[PDB]
Symmetry: D2
């Protein structure tokens, strides 16, 4: 018989809602049918006609853990935020200590992650100066992709690469048939502008944004684009903060380049005119942009110019944020988002009419899985896929309360904001891991995913 | 129980092949499941692991019929070509006599088509000078879209519209939320060039192609594009013959315009250096282009720049073609394609490695259905869709024999060419209409489809 | 010795002001020198250090004359407006009756023009449907270029050509090495829009502008561009009214196409928010555009995107304008400009800081002469050129008084507007034809110019 | 009276040839007249109707001199090459030792240059990391512009700047209203490619070209363009070697950016398929490109896409070139060109019909002078300009003989090539400095020019 049947689902995919029931066996979708009146299942879930979507696949997560677990994030804590947030599979970036830039470091993180994570996961390897030969190694060990930075953030730990190093990395990535994602900003210009701005006595959030303007973010995007154009590797530009950058990438992919654009809920749901009340808790890199650009971004999203959405969830000890209120240059970059990503998009996007459910599923589930090659398995509900669903409730009334976060850190740029939609049940591989705010699975439940 | 079960299917969609069985009831897909070992069905079909795809949806068909049925095509004859060709639903153009440019003419064609067609169908209305108010009427009667010509072909019967008339039609179409497809060429330039070329004594197929060069085809595309840009109606440019035109449209849709590009097997599988041996049987409008352009076209197809494929199946009394061997200007335009469309794409595209099955299904099934709004119903195999499938056989060895055609006319540009892949079973709404070359259904079986 | 010496000139050319004296003999510049202290001349003019520029060459004039001289304009009257306006050579369009579309009509107009004009002149031939062979004839008789319309204005008298006819004309023009200028608008769309707008009861100036929107003007420009791209003839798009059209042409010339952009003082010095007080006296085709577009236009001018400036001077019996106040559709298109062109540019351009003298001379003297091949002779003051100068006075204070116009008609869109700069002496071929508002030469003084 | 009269000149400017005589007094053009039959001059030169053009203004010269004068070039020697080559004013780059990156270094070079140069000169200042405040100083001391490198060549002596440093330099330049020229290549990518190529055992000229491919040259151009777009300073991209780069710059200037393109006779008259016989004597940076690209370059030149031509004359001890025959990586970059620039363009451009005299004068005389603000003075022959002419002879038959060079070094990529046109008399400020191969002026004759 069947392990579980979720019935009366208004199942959503990127191209439409279909009414059916899902039959799951051995952790995967065994069948999708119009009527299950006469089939037996050990467990039965009635969706009661609510929307059911595939588990969210977040390609941009910084739980960090490892030697810095007591300062940034713990697999067993933050992965609970994912679970309640409806994010069933994450791809951990390699920014941590030790840096995931070695086969050894990689194998160790995989072992650890597998023992403490509560949702499924895939892993990135790091592409830093001088570790070129390790890339092939991590690829063979299961890494789905790699990250390189054009502008650092944690010097010594994870360094930025020069155009030549970046170019060599692009060639290796192309030869392995992997994926390379980059943080595109101009390191050198940011430094110059910081000095000019600091000298003029700027300590604002406004001063911060100006030190890393769009023209430099866009120059880096342009540069990465020109180099991929020559290397041919699949490239994803991470957290693109402005409309013009989205267009640059779109235009290029539209011309045949295997390049894609990622943005995130922080850039869509926050504006520079929130800088004053949110302060350092909104300090992220690239900077959140203007209200005017924000409008454009939302149009591009619904219209298909933004390929994927990633949270860029990443903690920072609260004591490295608070000093930012008086002097911005003393607060670190980052914002948690694992627990607020879906509800924020559902709330200000879907329930506010500026985003369709179909598109949301495309950018938060399908494309990320597709781009990394973990597709049929994650990202959709078809016969053969892992049974990763979310039963949604678009008629909720509540607020985001950062202190209730399951992650190591308890603060958020969205703290206090209203939430009108959210996943109320989330299951991975056929088992309920979170139901109405409760995680029901033990640490280690999460499996490594690849291909 | 179930009416029929097709098992061991290697089911193909635009984004991948999934292994499952299809359960159909009351003419629609009732379920898709990994295993059907213990379910009862009146009839059982074993695909034996062959590829199964949705029935092909051809948006560009000219069976014509009506008062000219004994000269161009008959619903009960040509629709049999569709059936064996794997084309389960067609959309008849309104070029016939009387012209389908009136609510009355429309209602009459629907009645007739419904009584004699063997595959399902949707209908176009015509947008000609002076019939503006009839458009709203046909829309309300179920027309899925409309056609207008920028360059005539059958003066008196179906006339070309001027930019102003075309613009007014675009506005009506936008207001109805319908679709407008156009034949884009420059009537006036073609006439001028014809005179110059005829005067120089050109009677070639080469002379023909030169009389309707790409620069004029592309100018018309550019013009239609500028007008839709202003009207906002969904626009599909029919049979685009050259790479540059495809790019123009792609660029524009890529900029936000709801415009799409259609091409067909005649333009992909035939080249001007076939002109000498095929002669007038290859004379179509727009003209088939050069071998060099042909290469580009094939790349654009696999790469996603070509949105849909339509056969542009259309007969002409064989006595209006043969005189073309000696004097090209005396042969009419047109080519049959209902029976050779899929096998030609399967043969020279899929089985020759320059086209993926996934993409083929996208341009021959999904997009056409989607663009006209008959989607979930036709174009895919999901729970709720009409059970329209094709069991394929990509390991065939045979030739196309025009004399075996089931249509009124028995000739083809592809006559004699090899066929290595073809549908071997085709069913619409759960019933086998054609099995290994035999039509098994009576005239009238076809239903009207809309929305 | 020398016939005349103009000393203490601050001589302006497109690339700078140089301080010197001009020595003229036998109607042409015989020398330019830093000091003329010891040379004898029959007559001596002291510019006293004021700016001296070449006579303005206006390529877009509609004095009309001929059988309609008592209704539109007379050579001996309007050419006096040119003289005081600083326009030393004009190129008469062929829109008149009889139409200058024949060798005979051309020879007759040349004879007449030569007997009554007071400034020098060049002539256009007409390119209308069916007169293709006359073009070669007029070219050989001295025509500098030809005009064709894509949207009519005086049906029966001068007709618009279709794309095919226009294309054939382009080929003839290329083969003769002549110039073709066109009025680019979409005839058919304008008609459709007129009907829609009239039906909704529009009788405004606003209603007028909307009936011939920019999208149709720009479509025509795009179309002409595509056809010249194929023909290779020198093309000048006349009176371009909007920024986007200027860009389209600029982009194309920038890509190697021998195409150029013309605009005029009516489009730079008038805005739609002047429509209410100026009414029908501002009704011209293409329509004057918005204030926002006006700003762009001025930038493009100073920046080099606008190649030439032409007045498009053309009268209309005042009784065909006045009824326009109540019903716009009953007023004819056109505006006088021969007497207000330079002063308007000098006043609102140069003296207002948004246009440099150097650029003004480039677009009003040099380029027009250059494009038509009458260059060294007209358009500059070099050794060998006709001595055509203007002594300017950029420190004037006065108003334009249409009733003082020397032309047949006495009204203007600029009537009442202030004038702070104007030519105060104008001479052609070494003789003063106008000095401080007085014409001093008899009818017939004007010579035919060509090459 | 007059110091000298050059009569029967067929005087050429960017827009045409005019027949006249030039009267010079006190080193400048005092008059230009059609006939000088009755004027007295101390000296009389009869051009006999040959073409007369302004002295060539070369903006890209590396005589170097200073502490390295016995190794690279001497002002009194190389300036003689300029004189016979028809180059009347040069602008010395600041790459030398000590580097011209200081007010002191600048003042010293000016003193020296003024005492030993034989043709007139202007000076560049250097923009290197850390000397930002010196720029304002050199500007005030008369520097016409500054140079910065994006890819080094002489590390330690002249360093490349990072994007931030380059950006700060752009801002200073904009604020001073000066000019900044840059060497645009990607330093870091070149290094990476060098390693890959050397490892594969490449020691070719072919191997060299591949180590600094067009994609990296063009990326740097793109980058400089984006930064100027933001800074607004006048920018000239030096020695652009390929068609695509020319287009990138052209497109940008065409969009309003004050950016310009420079190329030189080495890139137009040499091709990679000359690499084998010329070897290291053709090794320059950026590398000379392919024959196919060469064709494009020549079209762009005559068509106006290339703004200026500079020789990039620069010596290298012959012992640092010869080892290049066996191992390319051991030969230095550079090529002499002061003596072969004009004759090479005259010979393979003008006398071969692919370049007009008018355009040649525009890119070799007018624009360079204009862009640096030394215009009316240098670059043309108008009343008030320095009398700098060249009497040309386009009917010569001879070969370039590097051993006859007047410069310190005696070798050239053009050695042995035919010369069919060349200046046969060259004068600066009214005095003959070179006549038929003989320099007739003493060292120090050259004056400093500025503004
Ligand atoms: Zn980042
Ligand atoms: Zn991140
Ligand atoms: Zn057609
Ligand atoms: Zn058709
Ligand atoms: Zn007009
Ligand atoms: Zn006109
Ligand atoms: Zn250089
Ligand atoms: Zn150099």
């Amino acid at each position: 018989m069947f392990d579980v049947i979720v019935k009366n689902c208004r199942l959503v995919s990127s191209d439409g809602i279909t009414e059916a029931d899902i039959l799951v066996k051995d952790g995967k979708v065994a069948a999708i049918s119009a009527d299950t009146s006469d089939v037996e299942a050990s467990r039965t879930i009635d969706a009661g006609g609510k929307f059911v979507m595939p588990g969210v696949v977040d390609e941009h997560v910084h739980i960090i853990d490892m030697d810095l677990k007591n300062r940034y994030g713990r697999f067993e804590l933050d992965s609970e935020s994912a679970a309640v947030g409806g994010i069933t599979t994450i791809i951990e970036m390699p920014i941590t200590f030790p840096p995931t830039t070695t086969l050894d470091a990689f194998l160790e993180k995989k072992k650890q992650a597998g023992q403490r994570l509560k949702v499924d996961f895939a892993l990135y390897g790091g592409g830093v100066p001088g570790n070129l030969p390790e890339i092939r190694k991590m690829h063979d060990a299961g890494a789905v992709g790699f990250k390189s930075m054009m502008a650092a953030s944690v010097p010594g730990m994870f360094d930025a690469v020069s155009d030549g190093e970046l170019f060599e990395i692009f060639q290796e990535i192309a030869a392995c048939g992997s994926v390379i994602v980059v943080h595109a900003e101009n390191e050198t210009i940011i430094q110059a502008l910081q000095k000019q701005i600091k000298a003029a006595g700027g300590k604002d959030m406004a001063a911060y944004e100006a030190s890393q303007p769009v023209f430099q973010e866009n120059e880096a995007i342009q540069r990465a684009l020109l180099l991929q154009k020559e290397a041919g590797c699949r490239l994803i530009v991470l957290h693109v903060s402005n409309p013009d950058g989205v267009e640059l990438i779109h235009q290029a992919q539209s011309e045949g380049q295997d390049v894609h654009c990622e943005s995130g809920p922080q850039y869509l749901n926050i504006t520079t005119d929130d800088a004053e009340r949110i302060g350092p808790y909104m300090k992220v890199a690239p900077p959140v942009r203007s209200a005017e650009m924000n409008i454009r971004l939302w149009e591009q999203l619904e219209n298909g110019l933004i390929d994927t959405l990633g949270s860029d969830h990443g903690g920072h000890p609260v004591e490295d944020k608070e000093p930012g209120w008086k002097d911005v240059w003393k607060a670190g970059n980052g914002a948690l988002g694992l627990e607020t990503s879906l509800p924020m998009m559902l709330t200000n996007g879907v329930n506010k009419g500026r985003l369709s459910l179909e598109r949301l599923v495309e950018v938060m589930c399908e494309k990320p899985a597709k781009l990394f090659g973990i597709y049929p398995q994650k990202g959709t509900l078809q016969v053969g896929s892992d049974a990763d669903l979310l039963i949604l409730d678009l008629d909720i009334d509540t607020k985001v309360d950062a202190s209730q976060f399951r992650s190591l850190h308890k603060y958020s740029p969205f703290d206090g904001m209203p939430v009108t939609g959210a996943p109320v049940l989330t299951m991975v591989r056929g088992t309920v891991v979170a139901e109405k705010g409760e995680v029901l699975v033990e640490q280690g439940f999460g499996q490594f995913v690849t291909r």
